[PDB]
Design a protein around this ligand. Sequence first.
Ligand code: FE
Length: 267
Amino acid sequence: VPLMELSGRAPVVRLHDIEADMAAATDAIRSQLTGWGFMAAEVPGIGERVEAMMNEFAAACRATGPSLSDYAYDVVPQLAVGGTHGFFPYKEFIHVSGAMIGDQPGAGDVLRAFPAFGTRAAEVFDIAFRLISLFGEVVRGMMPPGTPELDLSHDATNLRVIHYRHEHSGIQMLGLQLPPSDQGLQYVLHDGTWVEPVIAGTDVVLCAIGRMLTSASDGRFRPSTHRVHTKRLSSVLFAYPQHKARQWKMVDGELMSLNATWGDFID
Ligand SMILES: [Fe+3]
């Protein structure tokens, strides 16, 4: 599989000028989606933060004292309506939702128990959520006039961090892949050929179309199907709208509100 270099080629988006750099990068981002099926930006400083976070997750996964499995999803308080956050033991991974970061109560205890990791995760979540919200404003701008705002939900969005680890797409609106520890993640182009973005140990983030946005755009943007081939840590933000909010579609240029909710889409 061919390597796809993105350092020095994707638009630069600085941590302290995110909104204005993403405005400048709009046309480049639109042409990536048009021409590749996924999106990319280089965020100087992000890799340093993500590496520290992943390395602290790996140390936490080996904690014999307060253990991460003390915060397995089935012993963590969950929202009545929403996804499942917390730790998923063994390949082993954690879902840090925006609700968790706001302690929505006891749900935040895994971050009090592992606060070095938890502080990085909250920081990376905040950066990733601002980026991914602006990626969604770009995609909205490519859709017909009268397309609603994506209304990504802080609380319903989660950051996944994976320790030990087939072609697939996310079910959510957008995914933002953060620089992994190792190469192996691969994306398919519009012509069915696979590329391996060069992202391990970089500052490059990849933004993926998920199936909710494929549906909301009525198939205009295919999901950014991807896979992982190995020769290990990784994190990705999964952005969701409010589960109880009403589905919509832009069908043939015209806005349709459906009865089904975004929660129903997941089920
Ligand atoms: Fe994925």
